[PDB]
Structures are given as structure tokens and as C-alpha cells.
Design a protein around this ligand. Structure first.
Ligand code: MG
Length: 352
RNA sequence: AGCCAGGAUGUUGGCUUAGAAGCAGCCAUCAUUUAAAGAAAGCGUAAUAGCUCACUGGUCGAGUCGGCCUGCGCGGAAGA
RNA sequence: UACCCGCAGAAGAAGCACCGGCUAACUCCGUGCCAGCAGCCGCGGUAAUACGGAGGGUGCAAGCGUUAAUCGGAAUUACUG
RNA sequence: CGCGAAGAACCUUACCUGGUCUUGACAUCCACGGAAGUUUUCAGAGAUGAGAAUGUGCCUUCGGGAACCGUGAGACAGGUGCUGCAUGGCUGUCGUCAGCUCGUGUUGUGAAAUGUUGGGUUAAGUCCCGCAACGAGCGCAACCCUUAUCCUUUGUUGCCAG
RNA sequence: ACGACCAGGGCUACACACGUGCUACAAUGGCGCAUACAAAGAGAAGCGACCUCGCGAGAGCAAGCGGACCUCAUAAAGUGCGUCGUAGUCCGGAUUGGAGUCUGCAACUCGACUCCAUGAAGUCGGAAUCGCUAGUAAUCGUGGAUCAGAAUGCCACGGUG
RNA sequence: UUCUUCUAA
């Protein structure tokens, strides 16, 4: 009963936490009007507007009513815990044990529906990182950020896969494209595009003078064979490079952006990758613009476009600080092992 | 041939929707008061409903039906 | 009208800028090359008298700062020089 | 880079993986309860769980304390967590390199220069001479430890010529 | 809990790269026998004679000694005699098998050692590069620290030169 | 005889 009573408590604890994060009254005050608009039979005279109101009314309802059913079923747990203790029956005692568990899973999906309320979360994504303009500092600095997500998607458990591998000569790597793969990999990584800043005293410096570096991050969902727009082969620059003669360089001229594939000994599959690369890249270039037409450039990761300081990494002090949410940590290497996931949910539970 | 009547029981299969009901539909498609009537022919509904079919008997009082072999046709088949 | 008389009671009546040096006046805290500041030298890349806030202190005063503009300083067109 | 670490089978050990704990393993304070101590059992990988007899050393008109346990309450603990560009301490390095400086003095507007230079000389800013410098300090030398030889002393567990 | 404990693991992994070492590639050597030859330490839960057995590692007995007394503890190269006779060797010993000794709760990871078997590479090492100026280089042993056990390391010590 | 270059508190 000692885990069970905390399993009454800690379950009900996070229940009211989610009640704030919905702002389900802003759903419900809309809903209650939409309910009054529904039972108004004038909603049916435009039956298109009826389902646009009423199937939305159903969409407004059960998302709110989950949390209502969360508090209501937890009342029956402690009531059966009352009937567990004042009448010591081991069934009702274990009914306080067993039927308690069925509560959270109602919220556990819906909080997952609330956290991943973003639309193309369920797809996976690709990764696009260049070393910044720090210098030889930066090339290493990308290769650190290389393994950080490698260990992350190892730890989070996604299929890592090097689409493209470019290098800095003296230190680290210059730029990279990698296929991440699995459930909600764009669900995670959509909140982590852009600037990652190195600040440490430079061994590359002849003295130990404190220099600064940067790197890029860019995340775009795997949405080819899901998005209907086809790449025009004219802006699709046909260009060939080599394996690491079979590799295919694609330069999308009008938006000036590129994508590649390097590994396939068959040249077509380097291209067959790069079609999947670029069509996913064009749609993200559309959908970053599209959530910029939602209100403004606000419902994406605020203002990516090189204002993306969303995490910045300080090493001599060994502090790592988020910027799009602003959550901090000292366990710098754990984040380099992939405790960057705490920053992802920092974006998601803040609603970014 | 028409013509009179019905055209059914439910779990209106689940679905998942626009509400999904023989009839948008993924999908089973049963039992059922049976003269018969299908988890249905189509149309219709926003869906149901509405029309309506198969169907069944009532009426009708000679055949009826569409195959195949062919004979000759016919359309297709507009120019300075 | 000036001007005077009573009435009433502390009553109805103070703010703005500044404090790294230049230049009179400082600490605390937020903050970490960000946000910013700034006439100049120049500040802020975790301990900021230079940022922001606090308290404190300086400077004016029904004003106080900023900008604009002028000559001075500038002997920096040097008659003087 | 046979470095920390003069010596990781567990220990060490900080690490990894599970089992565990939250005034805590460790201090002090505080009350509360039992002398402390002593033996055993199972449960448990063990951390620990319930058993099992015991005890009264020390003082008192003595909570049973002073001894030691356990409980409560917290004040507090704890950190091999960060920072050797916040530090002390300590250490390498140039390098046992011969250099580094000061005082007053004079010189230059001054920064500075002078001496400390120059010449002979030394392993050495070592010495001498010259010397607007003259002095002083730290030094590079000497004092020290050992060995090289001799004398005296004492001669056992050391010595054996006679 | 960046705190406290416990077990097990790991710190010893392993395509690699480098430093520092050690041992060899032999005949000035190997082997065998015989034999001359130290210095400096350590020692009480320690050193442990002697004896016994164990091929050996050891065990058992068990003195002695806080040590100029006893023990660790014969130094080793050397020398003398023989042997190998220029070969992957009677060089050299890697590796591995089997059987043990021993430490310590306990030797899988992950100890040390004995014995038997095994007999790799290696036949003087690129460009380069290190040390050292006299008891030095060179090579010969020995002790100590640390330490249940566990040193080619380290710290010392004498031998030849 | 020949021989260069040293990111940005
Ligand atoms: Mg080397």
C-alpha cells in the first residue's frame, strides 16, 4: 500500500499539473459556446459548418473530458482505498492497487497527445549541422555535437544513420547530414534547430586565451511519400561526387540550399535518398514558412534564421543553459551523452 | 407484358465518420414474426429518411426468353 | 487695479539629472561580450562603483536632462599669437 | 607518459550495474529510552531483518544518566561536485644559470642611465686595477654531508699479529 | 542526493599509435661440473636456521634473534674443467596444454610461483635518434621502500671495468 | 647553395 498510496498521490499530483498546461477552460469556454452553438439548430443549416463546429466540439470535448475523467476515476480509487482500510478485504485492497493503475493511462496518452499536439511529430526527421565560424575550434565543436546526438539517439533509441559526412581537416567535422529514425524523432528534434555556441579557453590558441565558437543545427521531418509536391528536376541541380563516382550532390538553387547522399555504391540510391532528402527539405522550408503564416514566425521555434541560441554551451564553467526555455544544467557530459532530452521537453512543456 | 399488395427481424454489422444507418465507406454480411423481402439493385439523405429493385403473392389468359449458326442489309463513312 | 485688511490652518503646493576615469558624488543585487551602456578613455564573455534594479550619495531647481546651434577653450590659420 | 599511483583479486574505488538509507556513514548540540558489553538463530548476495539468553563498571534525594547504546526533534551533516586565471600551501622549469637589486649621490626635460662599467682574472658580479659614483643586499664562494689519509679514545656481538 | 551502505563488475577491454623498459638474436655464447668473490639493508604477527619430506613450488618440525650475536643470505659475473661447433641452433625463449605449490573470505574476470609438455618471432634492427668524459660508460649480482599476496618499476648497494 | 608560414580576450 506504501507505493500504492503514493501511486494515488503522485498520479493525482501530475494530473492537476496537466490541467494548467491544456488551458482547457479556453477550450471549454469555446466549447460551451460551441455547445450552445451546436444545440442551436442553425448550425445544421450549413451542415459543413455543423461538422466544422461539431466534430471540433467533439475534439474540444474529450481532450478536456480526459482530465475530467482523470480526477473522477481517481476519486473511486481512494474511495476503494477507504473500502480497503475500514473493511480489510484483500480484493478491495488490491482494487486500490489494480484499478489505480488504469487511471494514469487515460492521461498518459492524452498528455502524450498534449505534449505531441504538434502535427508532424510522428514522422522521423533528418539532421543538418555545420560547424560555425569559430574556426578550428568550431570544426571540433561540430564533431562534439556530432556524437552528442549520436549518443542521444542511441540513448533515446533511434536509428542513427550517416546520410552525409563532411570534415574539418585540423579538428573535427565541418558539416554532416544524418538520418535519425523512429517514432516521434521529429517529435523530439523539431525543437532543436540552430545555434549551438562553444565558449571555452582555446587549446587551439597559442596561449590559453578564451575564444568562442558556434555551430548550426537544422531539423526537418521525413515527409517524403507523405507530401504530394514533387521536386521540379530543374532546380534539382544534378551534381556528382564520390563515396566514402556514386554520390549525388543536389543544390536547390532558388532557396540556395543543398542536400546530398554519399554512401550508396549505386548512384541512383544516392539520388533516391536525395529526392527524399530534398522533398522533406522543401516541405520544412514550406512548413517553417507556414507556421510563420499562422500568427507570425512564432509557433515554430520562435525566430530561427540564426536567431537560435536555444541552448548555449559553456565549458570552462561547465554550465549548460537552454535559451528557448532557459533551463540549466551542470552535468555537461550527460547532456553530451544525450541529456539534451530534458531541453526538448523544456520546449514542449513550455509549449514550444 | 403490364397490373394490386408488400418489400421484412434485429447489432441502423463493427467501423468512423460529415452523423455511417443495404446505399462515402476498411469490413463482416447473420439469424430473423417469411407469401416473400437482400447487414440490398440503384437514386436520393449531410446521414437516416424519400424514391425504389430484386423479391413475393393478388391480377392477367398465350406462349415466353436469348442463346448459337447463317443470308442479305445498316451505322460508322469529312475536300477542296 | 496697485495696495491693504481679516479669515483659515501646516494647511493647497518638488522635481529632474548624475556617482569608472575625465569630474563633485557607492554600495548592494539582477546580469553574464547577452541584455545593454556610451561625449572621450571605454564598459558587459558569471564577482559590472561603467548594464538593469535597489538603497545611499552628488548636482540643479519649478524646473531638470537630451538634441540642435554658436564662439570660447583652439596659440587648432598662431595680427595679437 | 615504469608520472600522480611506494605496488586495483573484492578492498582500494572515486566508476559501472542492481540492492538499499535519509539528522543521516561521519561531528556537535537536544531531549527521550536502555549500563555498556555479552552470545546465538533464520531472512538476506550482502547492505539488514525479526529472534536468543545477558549486563550493571561509575557516581549520586542518580530523567537511569556521567560510560555506551537506540529513538525523536532539528540545528546541522556530507561532497574525490566546479573553479590552480578566485587561492594558500606545495612542486617543475629555465638553472646551481651568474646573475639580480637597493641606498644615497651625481646625469639626463624625462623614461632612464650611473655603479653593475672598463681593463687584467675566475668555475663564479671571482678577484685585481682603472673607474661619478660610493656603499649595501640577494646571490658565486665559504660554513654543511660523505669519502680520500693520519692521531687519540674505546675495544664487543668486531678484531688474531704476538 | 553530486551524500551514506552492500554485492558483483570495471579500473587489466583492444583493428591501432607512441613513449619508457626488460630479454634475446649466441660461441667473449649456451650447457654441465667444480670453485674464488661482496657491499648495503631488513627483521618481531617479523626474520625464521636446523631437521624432515616434497624434483620443485613447498609443507611439517622448529631453533635462534629487536639483532656488530640469530635469520633473511651461498653474492653474481669470475675461475677451472668438459661439452655444444656457427645451426632459428644445446641460440633464444613467445605462446599454449596438463598437473601443482602459495597467498588471502576467496585467485573466473584478475595474483604469484613450481613441474611437465610447447619451442613463435628474432640470426643486430629504416629515415632518424639517445645516453654517457673515469670507477664513468659498459655489464655483474644484492637489498630496500611499497606491500595478505603481487615488480623487468623505483630507491639503494657492492663486483668487474 | 637552398629554405616559408603562426586564426580570432
Ligand atoms: Mg616515438
Amino acid at each position: 500500500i506504501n507505493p500504492v498510496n503514493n501511486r494515488i498521490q503522485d498520479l493525482t499530483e501530475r494530473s492537476d499539473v496537466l490541467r494548467g498546461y491544456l488551458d482547457y477552460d479556453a477550450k471549454k469556454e469555446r466549447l460551451e459556446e460551441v455547445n450552445a452553438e451546436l444545440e442551436q439548430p442553425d448550425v445544421w443549416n450549413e451542415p459543413e459548418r455543423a461538422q466544422a463546429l461539431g466534430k471540433e466540439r467533439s475534439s474540444l470535448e474529450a481532450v478536456v473530458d480526459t482530465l475530467d475523467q482523470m480526477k473522477q476515476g481517481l476519486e473511486d480509487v481512494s474511495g476503494l482505498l477507504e473500502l480497503a482500510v475500514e473493511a480489510d478485504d484483500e480484493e478491495t485492497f488490491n482494487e486500490a492497487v489494480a484499478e489505480l493503475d488504469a487511471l494514469e493511462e487515460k492521461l498518459a496518452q492524452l498528455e502524450f497527445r498534449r505534449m505531441f499536439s504538434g502535427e508532424y511529430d510522428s514522422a522521423d526527421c533528418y539532421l543538418d549541422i555545420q560547424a560555425g565560424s569559430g574556426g578550428t575550434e568550431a570544426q571540433d565543436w561540430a564533431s562534439m555535437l556530432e556524437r552528442m546526438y549520436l549518443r542521444w539517439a542511441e540513448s533515446r533509441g533511434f536509428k542513427t544513420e550517416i546520410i552525409e559526412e563532411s570534415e574539418g581537416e585540423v579538428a573535427g567535422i565541418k558539416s554532416v547530414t544524418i538520418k535519425i529514425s523512429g517514432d516521434y524523432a521529429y517529435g523530439w528534434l523539431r525543437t532543436e534547430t540552430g545555434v549551438h555556441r562553444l565558449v571555452r579557453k582555446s587549446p587551439f590558441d597559442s596561449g590559453g586565451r578564451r575564444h568562442t565558437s558556434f555551430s548550426s543545427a537544422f531539423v526537418y521531418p521525413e515527409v517524403d511519400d507523405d507530401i504530394d509536391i514533387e521536386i521540379n528536376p530543374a532546380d534539382l541541380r544534378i551534381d556528382v561526387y564520390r563515396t566514402s563516382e556514386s554520390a549525388v550532390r543536389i543544390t536547390h538553387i532558388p532557396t540556395g540550399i543543398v542536400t546530398q547522399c554519399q554512401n550508396d555504391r549505386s548512384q541512383h540510391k544516392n539520388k533516391d535518398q536525395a529526392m527524399k532528402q530534398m522533398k522533406a527539405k522543401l516541405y520544412e522550408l514550406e512548413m517553417q514558412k507556414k507556421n510563420a503564416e499562422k500568427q507570425a514566425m512564432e509557433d515554430n521555434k520562435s525566430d530561427i534564421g540564426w536567431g537560435s541560441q536555444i541552448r548555449s554551451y559553456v565549458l570552462d564553467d561547465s554550465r549548460i543553459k537552454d535559451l528557448r526555455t532557459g533551463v540549466e544544467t551542470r552535468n555537461t557530459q550527460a547532456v553530451l551523452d544525450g541529456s539534451l532530452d530534458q531541453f526538448i521537453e523544456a520546449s514542449l512543456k513550455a509549449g514550444l
